Design an enzyme around this catalytic site. Structure first.
Site, PDB file in Angstrom:
ATOM      1  CD  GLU A 199      -2.672  -1.408   2.473  1.00 35.67           C
ATOM      2  OE1 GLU A 199      -2.630  -0.517   3.348  1.00 35.67           O
ATOM      3  OE2 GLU A 199      -3.376  -2.429   2.588  1.00 35.67           O
TER       4      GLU A 199
ATOM      5  CD  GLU B  32      -4.517  -8.280   1.746  1.00 37.31           C
ATOM      6  OE1 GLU B  32      -5.337  -7.671   2.459  1.00 37.31           O
ATOM      7  OE2 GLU B  32      -3.303  -7.967   1.696  1.00 37.31           O
TER       8      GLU B  32
HETATM    9  O1  LIG Z   1      -6.716  -8.791  11.652  1.00 37.02           O
HETATM   10  C1  LIG Z   1      -6.553  -7.688  10.775  1.00 37.02           C
HETATM   11  C2  LIG Z   1      -6.035  -8.179   9.422  1.00 37.02           C
HETATM   12  O2  LIG Z   1      -7.005  -9.011   8.806  1.00 37.02           O
HETATM   13  C3  LIG Z   1      -5.750  -6.982   8.522  1.00 37.02           C
HETATM   14  O3  LIG Z   1      -5.238  -7.414   7.308  1.00 37.02           O
HETATM   15  C4  LIG Z   1      -5.058  -6.375   6.330  1.00 37.02           C
HETATM   16  C5  LIG Z   1      -6.341  -6.148   5.544  1.00 37.02           C
HETATM   17  O4  LIG Z   1      -6.162  -5.015   4.675  1.00 37.02           O
HETATM   18  C6  LIG Z   1      -5.116  -5.206   3.705  1.00 37.02           C
HETATM   19  O5  LIG Z   1      -4.992  -4.023   3.000  1.00 37.02           O
HETATM   20  C7  LIG Z   1      -3.773  -5.547   4.387  1.00 37.02           C
HETATM   21  O6  LIG Z   1      -2.790  -5.863   3.405  1.00 37.02           O
HETATM   22  C8  LIG Z   1      -3.953  -6.729   5.348  1.00 37.02           C
HETATM   23  O7  LIG Z   1      -2.745  -6.980   6.048  1.00 37.02           O
HETATM   24  O8  LIG Z   1      -4.792  -6.106   9.140  1.00 37.02           O
HETATM   25  C9  LIG Z   1      -5.274  -5.554  10.386  1.00 37.02           C
HETATM   26  C10 LIG Z   1      -5.568  -6.680  11.387  1.00 37.02           C
HETATM   27  O9  LIG Z   1      -6.118  -6.131  12.576  1.00 37.02           O
HETATM   28  O1  LIG Z   2      -6.706  -0.217   6.586  1.00 36.57           O
HETATM   29  C1  LIG Z   2      -6.854  -0.427   5.190  1.00 36.57           C
HETATM   30  C2  LIG Z   2      -8.197   0.141   4.722  1.00 36.57           C
HETATM   31  O2  LIG Z   2      -8.198   1.553   4.876  1.00 36.57           O
HETATM   32  C3  LIG Z   2      -8.445  -0.216   3.254  1.00 36.57           C
HETATM   33  O3  LIG Z   2      -9.716   0.193   2.879  1.00 36.57           O
HETATM   34  O4  LIG Z   2      -8.357  -1.638   3.060  1.00 36.57           O
HETATM   35  C4  LIG Z   2      -7.058  -2.165   3.397  1.00 36.57           C
HETATM   36  C5  LIG Z   2      -6.764  -1.924   4.880  1.00 36.57           C
HETATM   37  O5  LIG Z   2      -5.465  -2.406   5.195  1.00 36.57           O
END
Ligand SMILES: O[C@@H]1[C@@H](O)[C@H](O[C@@H]2CO[C@@H](O)[C@H](O)[C@H]2O)OC[C@H]1O
Ligand SMILES: O[C@@H]1[C@@H](O)[C@H](O)OC[C@H]1O
Ligand code: NA
Length: 330
Positions: free
Chosen positions: A133, A240
């Site tokens: 990101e 994801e």
């Molecule tokens: O448990 C939470 C995770 O599921 C979370 O994971 C992130 C989701 O947003 C993506 O953009 C990220 O790459 C990924 O790591 O992170 C926060 C945690 O509390």
């Molecule tokens: O916090 C982030 C959130 O702002 C975005 O929308 O999705 C990815 C997350 O990691």
């Protein structure tokens, strides 16, 4: 489930099927994982704060357990993530006096972390989300502000990729991001990766997070992004994936269950998405969901804390949802 199709088998000739996990969910959703996926990603335990909480103090225990699980079931592992503006301890950017460190000092720390982490899992982890990101999600600027960028300069990403490549030159290195299909951001991500590849930087793929909703991004936007990124010559991983029952403007917290309409549209949405992924099987090599069943999802607390979402292919009882049937029948 006896006669249920296996996700990884259904898509055997198209792409790997993965799931984000943690030691607790591996136990809780063990059978689903064993029956459906051939790739695993640590939801949180391979992030900086969970690997090197204090300088010189490495805590690989949880990550080791996840890797052990994956390897014992012949599942691939995606490493997530090395350099990110989130979940990185304050010590990384400070000196003894508590002031920000210099460019060279931060680069030394970045190299040490990357080298130690990547070398530990060399031979078991085939790819890494090196930069996560870095592109701005709002505004006209290309990059998001972060301590990494502030201290080192805009070339911090070039350095991260080079350090990771040196640590394991056989790994596939990725730039990972969300809202990757909205035109404005898509062009920023494209421009950034093109710039890096034009300099010979070892970035091998783009990770499309795909934290999507029932309506956004549109199928045409998804197609356009896949084609735009693929034109760079990089490999593509959907990293994801989840389909939220709530649009960004929808911050309701009283819904105890999804409506039949939500369930039906989600089924259609997942079918359309997978039909498109299959169409682009030549460039997409892996599709990982950010979880596997509705009994565990980060969307329960994000972006609205304390509610419930139903974003995946299996329900809270680990039974296939309508979305499952449409996804595997493309
Ligand atoms: O448990 C939470 C995770 O599921 C979370 O994971 C992130 C989701 O947003 C993506 O953009 C990220 O790459 C990924 O790591 O992170 C926060 C945690 O509390
Ligand atoms: O916090 C982030 C959130 O702002 C975005 O929308 O999705 C990815 C997350 O990691
Ligand atoms: Na493929």
């Amino acid at each position: 489930n006896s006669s249920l199709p296996s996700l990884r088998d259904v898509f055997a000739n198209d792409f790997r099927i993965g799931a984000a996990v943690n030691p607790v969910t591996i136990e809780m959703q063990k059978q689903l994982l064993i029956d459906h996926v051939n790739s695993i990603t640590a939801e949180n335990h391979m992030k900086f704060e969970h690997l090197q909480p204090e300088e010189g103090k490495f805590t690989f225990q949880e990550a080791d357990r996840i890797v052990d699980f994956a390897c014992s079931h012949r599942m691939a592992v995606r490493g997530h993530t090395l350099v990110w503006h989130n979940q990185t301890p304050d010590w990384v950017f400070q000196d003894g006096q508590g002031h920000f460190v210099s460019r060279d000092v931060l680069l030394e720390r970045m190299k040490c972390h990357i080298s130690t982490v990547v070398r530990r899992y060399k031979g078991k982890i085939y790819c890494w989300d090196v930069i996560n990101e870095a592109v701005a999600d709002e505004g006209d600027e290309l990059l998001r502000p972060s301590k990494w960028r502030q201290i080192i300069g805009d070339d911090f990403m070039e350095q991260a990729f080079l350090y990771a490549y040196e640590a394991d030159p056989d790994a596939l290195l990725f730039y990972n991001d969300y809202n990757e299909c909205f035109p404005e951001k898509r062009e920023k991500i494209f421009a950034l990766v093109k710039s890096l590849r034009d300099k010979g930087i070892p970035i091998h793929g783009i990770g499309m997070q795909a934290h999507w909703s029932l309506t956004r991004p549109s199928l045409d936007e998804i197609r356009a992004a896949i084609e735009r990124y693929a034109s760079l010559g990089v490999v593509l991983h959907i990293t994801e994936l989840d389909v939220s029952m709530f649009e960004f403007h929808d911050r309701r917290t009283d819904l105890a269950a999804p409506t039949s309409e939500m369930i039906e549209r989600q089924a259609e949405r997942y079918g359309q998405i997978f039909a498109l992924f299959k169409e682009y099987r030549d460039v997409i090599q892996s599709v990982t969901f950010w979880g596997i069943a509705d009994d565990h999802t980060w969307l329960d607390n994000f972006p609205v804390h304390g509610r419930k979402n139903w974003p995946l292919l299996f329900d809270e009882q680990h039974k296939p949802k309508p979305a499952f049937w449409r996804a595997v029948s493309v």
